[PDB]
UniProtKB/Swiss-Prot annotation, chains A, B:
It is found in: Cytoplasm. Its main location: cytoplasm. It comes from Podospora anserina (strain S / ATCC MYA-4624 / DSM 980 / FGSC 10383) (Pleurage anserina). Keywords: Apoptosis, Cytoplasm. Responsible for heterokaryon incompatibility, a process that ensures that during spontaneous, vegetative cell fusion only compatible cells from the same colony survive (non-self-recognition). Interaction with the prion form [het-s] of incompatible cells triggers a lethal reaction that prevents the formation of viable heterokaryons. Homodimer. Forms heterodimers with het-s. This is Heterokaryon incompatibility protein S. GO terms for molecular function: identical protein binding.
Amino acid sequence: SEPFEIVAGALGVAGLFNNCVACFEYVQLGRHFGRDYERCQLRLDIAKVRLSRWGEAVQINDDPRFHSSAPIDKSVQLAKSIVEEILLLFESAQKTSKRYELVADQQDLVVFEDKDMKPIGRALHRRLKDLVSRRQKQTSLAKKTAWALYDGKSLEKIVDQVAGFVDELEKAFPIEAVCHKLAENEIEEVEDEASLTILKDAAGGIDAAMSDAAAQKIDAIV
Amino acid sequence: SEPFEIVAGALGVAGLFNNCVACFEYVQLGRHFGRDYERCQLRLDIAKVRLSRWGEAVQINDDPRFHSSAPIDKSVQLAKSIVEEILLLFESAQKTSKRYELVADQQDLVVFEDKDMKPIGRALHRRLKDLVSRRQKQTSLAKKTAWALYDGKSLEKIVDQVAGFVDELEKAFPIEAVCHKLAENEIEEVEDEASLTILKDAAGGIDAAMSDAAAQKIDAIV
Ligand SMILES: [Cl-]
Ligand SMILES: [Cl-]
Ligand SMILES: [Cl-]
Ligand SMILES: [Cl-]
């Protein structure tokens, strides 16, 4: 119910955006994900990075238009609506999850911890988390509470909708080139093909810029 | 907008539900729908009927569990969550519609009126509206404001999710037999094959009870 409270407040785009990004931190994945755990965790991580990349490109913390409750500029009004919609998406996912916990038995309520990931997925996950931590202006934000995604549909919906919403966000601002360069910089630290191939597969359908940067880099060996 | 403010209140399942049903009333469809206008309108109508049928079956206005702000029975808690989620869905739809109006040309913003409907579609639409109007508790609710669906995906989202949520609603309550008898009563005034054919097509995928009730009628005269 926290995302709902945030949307009910008087934040500008920047405050709403920073709450969107922080929403990703304490989502857990149910044991149901099985062997798809790593890719699904990374698709969540990628959706987050995508959001962080836009904020960076648009200089969210330095553009005064993003700091008012009532923006005038159409692009910024669009951005505000989109970022509110992302929060509503997390709110609704938390509701679905709550309905599941109400009816399920203890066996179906087991979740993965970060240590459960394969070593390569684990390492990409750390790299993707740290990358947005650098970008994210430091937390005034109150801590959020942990909750779990228990089925694939729920995760797909977040990851797919966030990605579409960032597409809309990028469309509204003159940041086409900046975002592609940023995607290139994000990936300069991963050298081995194994990690690049896992990244490109998880980025499929949700981050064309990361997918292109990874596909181009795998040729710097093959 | 309004749906968010409704969810932010202190209503019980009954108040929230009645607001869900009232949300359908002032949805407009943009001229984009073309030949598909009639069917898409009826699919919205059917999702509304679907919702009203559950309320009638469960005696939404008479069962006092549906009046508490903090219900105790798990099934009623489930119902409250779903009904809140339907309101959130309408609120996102309105946000998407506002983003469209902010950027669209004047010609892109023309909407159908009910009188633009072809005769058999028109008649079926009056019928479905009349049916839920007499089911619905006399409105003390404040009047909501008109807004438009400008593309098919926005409409499909509402129709598919509401149908899916009424499924979850029906599972939470011992009302299997009741909803079937109710679906039969809805269709026994419409007699012509041409109307039942168009009705059944529109009900496909979203209301199986109505689909069968229309199927037994067309088979009775063929
Ligand atoms: Cl702010
Ligand atoms: Cl502004
Ligand atoms: Cl879930
Ligand atoms: Cl109530």
